[PDB]
């Protein structure tokens, strides 16, 4: 069936429609309505419903005025997606992605679902941008709107990352984060895809605490499961697995720890580093790298948990004294011994204080 | 001798100079030139007639700086010029059509000072010159300004092979941006890949691609060359 | 002014505004002495028939020949994004980390 395979790959590659069964079955998809009501519905009608919702969201926030200028404009009723060159489909996917990053906080609200339902029912973001749309509804993977997404979602235009949702598309029930986290352990393609999203919304200052807590949760239980996989006890295998783990996780934490203007994902990366020094027996030079970057990515708002991470990292480090920059910024900590006593009521602080005072002997 | 073959059989020879006593390590054809590099001299033939043109002699300071261990190389848009890497840290810029040393560039980090391997970039006017103490330095060579600096080699095991990818993708933790480097070492059989975009992170290593050079074993592992097959994954 | 605000109201409502929808969518160290003395005629060779500007241009210096051949090396391969600090980032870009 060689020609059947090549034509099948053309058909699953095909982003357009050429019979009337597929205009009706393609225009039938909707978040709000039913299929029978959504088939016989022009685009001025859907623009009225939605753009009522986008008037509401433009009252509720303020960064939606350029998307009034482009995406929810009065002229965007007549923009067919499939008659657009790839520079135009690329730029339109840029504005679609930036709008969806912007919306993703308020997504339990019906004005947000109305605006997203205009993006689906005209621009077919469920057919052209499924990674970003699954990435934005995927924090809210327990609300029923995620299951309406899982009923309008095309089964074979979904990234291999997100293909764990196939029995949840098949039987219309929302998936648990046991399943999300389990395939986040086995596939590093998935765990990077979440962290490629969350860091992309924070360079433009569009974060929200469900995104921060959701991402930090998946990195927490996921890196736990990864360390439990990567243990073997064979020396060269656990060395090679420690290097592979640092190469997977490494750059995500390396921006997240320094991202001072988002103290949330700064604290979540503190959290994953604390898990990583705690359960994962990483080498002393790696732990000095975590301590020095923790020391550099430092805020008044993230003082108090960052000190706890210094106690964890210094406590599981095998060498005795600290290194330089750590001692300098801990000098710049205002209430040192009192804060370390409050930490020592619940943790162990003594190797951190020993590395400090020994480094002060060596200054 | 320098024989010249086609279809499996010999179609030419090439006239070596009389004053030559050294084994000859770098054959390099570009422009209208065939250029070979022996050990401390470079003999250059005109390729349109197979006829010997000149012999380029590098400078000498301490009888080791004249040695030519990085080889020689060509840039794409640089006209009649050849870039040599010495046993000092120097890489010299030679107009091979007229013989002159036109420019010389000095290593960064003067503790690391023997050019072990050098390669052009897919960008214009940039090189990956590769020192025995460990650094890969990748440079403008008409601004003479460093673009990146990396610490790829061990002092016990420097980079001896370095090869960029000209596919156009491969980097950015999903794979959509170019800037994928490959390096290897004569001491190990493990090749190391570098994402090259922000500061050039490492991204992985093929461990025992070929066998390692094993002390007290009879097998003969190690590596000799890396090449990205150009324009391809 | 030739186009009043009322006239642009009617042009937006009646006719269509894909033009404005599109417009809103779209928002040295050394010097060689040889390249004064390396003149090349471009329409000799077939592979150099296609980096001249107009049809009637041959006499091209080594400088101008270098510029055209740079523009074609960019034409076959545009300039990469990487070619245009932190302790853990330096730890990742350092190969002393990854040992055996």
């Amino acid at each position: 069936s060689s020609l059947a395979q090549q034509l099948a790959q053309i058909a699953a590659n095909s982003r357009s429609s050429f019979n009337v069964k597929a205009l009706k079955a393609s225009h039938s998809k909707s978040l709000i309505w039913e299929p029978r009501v959504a088939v016989s519905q022009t685009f001025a009608e859907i623009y009225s419903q939605c753009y009522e919702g986008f008037k509401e969201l433009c009252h509720l926030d303020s960064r939606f005025v350029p998307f009034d200028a482009t995406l929810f404009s009065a002229q965007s009723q007549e923009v067919d997606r499939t008659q657009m060159t790839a520079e135009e489909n690329a730029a339109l996917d840029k504005r679609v992605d930036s709008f969806l990053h912007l919306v993703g906080s308020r997504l339990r609200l019906m004005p947000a679902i109305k605006a997203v339902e205009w993006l689906i029912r005209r621009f077919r973001i469920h057919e052209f941008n499924t990674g970003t749309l699954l990435a934005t509804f995927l924090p809210y993977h327990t609300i029923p709107a995620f299951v309406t997404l899982l009923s309008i979602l095309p089964v074979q235009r979904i990234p291999i990352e997100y293909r764990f949702l196939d029995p949840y598309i098949k039987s219309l029930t929302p998936p648990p984060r046991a399943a999300i986290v389990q395939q986040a352990t086995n596939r590093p393609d998935l765990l990077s895809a979440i962290s490629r999203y969350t860091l992309d919304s924070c360079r433009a200052k569009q974060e929200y605490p469900g995104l921060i807590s959701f991402w930090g949760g998946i990195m927490a239980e996921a890196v736990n499961g990864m360390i439990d996989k990567m243990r073997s006890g064979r020396r060269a295998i656990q060395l090679e697995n420690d290097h592979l783990l640092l190469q997977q996780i490494g750059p995500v934490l390396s921006e997240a720890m320094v991202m001072k203007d988002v103290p949330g994902i700064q604290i979540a990366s503190y959290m994953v580093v604390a898990i990583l020094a705690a359960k994962g027996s990483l080498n002393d030079n790696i732990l000095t790298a975590f301590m020095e970057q923790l020391v550099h990515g430092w805020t008044v708002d993230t003082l108090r948990p960052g000190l706890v991470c210094l106690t964890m990292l210094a406590q599981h480090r095998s060498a005795k004294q600290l290194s330089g920059r750590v001692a300098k910024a801990v000098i710049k900590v205002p209430d040192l011994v009192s804060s370390l006593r409050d930490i020592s009521k619940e943790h162990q602080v003594d190797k951190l204080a020993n590395g400090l005072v020994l480094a002060f002997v060596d200054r | 001798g320098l024989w010249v073959f086609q279809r499996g059989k010999k179609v030419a020879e090439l006239p070596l100079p009389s004053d030559l006593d050294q084994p000859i390590k770098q054959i390099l054809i570009f422009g209208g030139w065939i250029v070979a590099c022996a050990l401390t001299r470079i003999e250059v033939w005109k390729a349109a007639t197979l006829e010997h043109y000149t012999t380029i002699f590098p400078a000498a300071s301490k009888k080791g700086d004249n040695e030519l261990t990085g080889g020689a190389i060509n840039m794409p848009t640089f006209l009649n010029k050849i870039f040599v890497g010495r046993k000092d840290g120097w890489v010299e810029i030679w107009n091979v059509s007229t013989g002159k040393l036109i420019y010389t560039l000095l290593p960064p980090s003067p503790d690391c000072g023997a050019v072990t391997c050098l390669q052009p970039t897919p960008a214009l006017s940039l090189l990956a010159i590769a020192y025995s103490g460990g650094p890969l330095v990748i440079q403008n060579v008409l601004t003479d300004k460093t673009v990146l600096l990396l610490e790829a080699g061990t002092d016990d095991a420097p980079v001896t092979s370095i090869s960029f990818r000209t596919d156009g993708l491969g980097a950015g933790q999903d794979g959509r941006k170019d800037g994928v480097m490959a390096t290897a070492t004569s001491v190990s059989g493990d090749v190391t890949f570098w994402d090259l975009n922000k500061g050039g992170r490492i991204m992985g290593v093929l461990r025992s691609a070929h066998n390692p050079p094993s002390r007290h074993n009879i097998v003969r592992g190690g590596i000799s060359k890396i090449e990205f097959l150009a324009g391809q994954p | 002014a030739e186009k009043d605000a009322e006239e642009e109201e009617l042009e937006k409502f009646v006719l269509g505004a894909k033009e404005t929808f599109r417009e809103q969518l779209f928002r040295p160290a050394w010097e060689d002495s040889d390249d004064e003395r390396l003149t090349i005629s471009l329409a000799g060779a077939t592979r150099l028939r296609k980096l001249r500007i107009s049809e009637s241009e041959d006499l091209v210096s080594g400088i101008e020949y270098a510029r055209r051949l740079r523009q074609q090396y960019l034409r076959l391969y545009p300039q990469p994004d990487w070619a245009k600090p932190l302790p853990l980032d330096s730890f990742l870009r350092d190969a002393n980390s990854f040992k055996v």
Partner: peptide
């Protein structure tokens, strides 16, 4: 199954030849 490798065919490439540098 999703993500299995395709068969290797040689990818074409308009590469740059260097005999015009002289």
């Amino acid at each position: 199954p999703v993500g299995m490798p395709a068969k290797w065919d040689v990818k074409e490439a308009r590469k740059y030849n260097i005999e015009a540098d002289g």
